[PDB]
Amino acid sequence: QASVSIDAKFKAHGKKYLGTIGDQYTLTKNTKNPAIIKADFGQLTPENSMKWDATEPNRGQFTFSGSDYLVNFAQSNGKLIRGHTLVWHSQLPGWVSSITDKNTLISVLKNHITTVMTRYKGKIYAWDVLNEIFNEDGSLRNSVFYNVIGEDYVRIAFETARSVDPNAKLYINDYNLDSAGYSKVNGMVSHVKKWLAAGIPIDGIGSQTHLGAGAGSAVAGALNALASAGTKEIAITELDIAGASSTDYVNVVNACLNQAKCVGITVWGVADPDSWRSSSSPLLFDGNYNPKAAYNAIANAL
Numbered sequence: 001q002a003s004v005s006i007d008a009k010f011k012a013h014g015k016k017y018l019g020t021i022g023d024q025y026t027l028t029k030n031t032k033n034p035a036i037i038k039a040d041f042g043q044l045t046p047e048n049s050m051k052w053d054a055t056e057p058n059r060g061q062f063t064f065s066g067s068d069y070l071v072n073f074a075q076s077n078g079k080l081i082r083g084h085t086l087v088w089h090s091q092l093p094g095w096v097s098s099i100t101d102k103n104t105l106i107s108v109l110k111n112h113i114t115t116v117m118t119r120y121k122g123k124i125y126a127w128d129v130l131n132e133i134f135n136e137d138g139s140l141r142n143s144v145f146y147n148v149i150g151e152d153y154v155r156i157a158f159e160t161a162r163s164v165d166p167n168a169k170l171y172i173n174d175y176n177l178d179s180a181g182y183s184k185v186n187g188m189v190s191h192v193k194k195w196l197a198a199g200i201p202i203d204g205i206g207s208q209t210h211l212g213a214g215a216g217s218a219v220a221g222a223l224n225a226l227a228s229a230g231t232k233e234i235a236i237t238e239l240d241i242a243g244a245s246s247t248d249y250v251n252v253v254n255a256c257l258n259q260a261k262c263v264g265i266t267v268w269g270v271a272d273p274d275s276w277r278s279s280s281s282p283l284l285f286d287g288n289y290n291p292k293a294a295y296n297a298i299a300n301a302l
């Protein structure tokens with residue numbers, strides 16, 4: 001645990017949180033990891049336990065052991081929770097992707113959303129209802145949901161989420177929304193504008209922000225461009241930067257800090273060894289679970 005909590009300093013600027021991720025393994029693999037989460041971060045996103053493959057492995061048969069643990073740990077330690085993720089083409093069981101009947105897929109989609117959200121009703125700050133539904137050019141990704149149901153799946157997912165838990169902020173999450181003018185950014189903005197005008201309950205846009213070295217400075221503009229979609233809020237949901245330079249990290253923190261709609265930042269992991277991009281040392285804590293330079297840089301910028 002770093003003596004200075006970046007979550008605390010971020011919150012002092014009016015932001016809701018500066019969080020990270022977790023699940024049973026990383027929360028128990030050693031003493032430093034859970035200790036860092038409790039001391040320096042104010043929000044948690046389950047790294048894998050709430051995804052479709054881990055929650056409904058067989059049609060109508062749910063497995064909530066992992067998700068229960070993450071939710072319980074967060075709730076037991078005053079950490080906000082971002083549910084992740086309800087509808088996604090990746091980490092999706094074969095039984096779902098093989099469905100070809102529209103009404104059958106809609107029923108399945110609604111039952112999944114309903115069961116997962118009802119189990120944690122009122123405990124979730126934000127749900128990534130839809131994840132990565134756009135192609136790089138801004139068009140809609142041809143996942144089984146898009147192919148079988150069509151564009152109406154967007155409305156169905158959000159409306160169902162809204163009715164099941166009206167207390168949760170409903171998000172559409174995606175990666176590569178990292179610089180203004182990028183095709184995917186333009187596609188995210190125009191579609192959301194349309195969906196909001198049609199009455200679809202989309203509360204926020206989540207920008208994963210998985211960056212390469214030097215890409216930090218373009219994030220501010222990307223967030224400004226996303227703010228034009230018209231959602232109530234936006235958030236950096238899965239931050240990690242190859243090389244973890246202070247310049248990059250401070251640039252990203254300031255990007256959110258200086259944009260009114262940005263409610264928080266979630267770093268995709270605590271320490272480098274546990275990163276899904278470990279070879280690039282993209283996180284705030286090192287192999288010894290000690291604060292890296294970027295962590296201190298972030299603290300001193302706040």
Ligand SMILES: O[C@@H]1[C@@H](O)[C@H](O[C@@H]2CO[C@@H](O[C@@H]3CO[C@@H](O)[C@H](O)[C@H]3O)[C@H](O)[C@H]2O)OC[C@H]1O
Binds near residue numbers: 048084132175
């Ligand atoms: O068997 C499981 C592994 O296959 C799985 O690997 C994870 C893959 O997802 C990563 O989280 C995503 C990163 O990219 C984004 O676009 C998604 O929205 C995130 O959810 C995660 O970090 C990897 O660990 O997880 C481990 C096993 O459960």
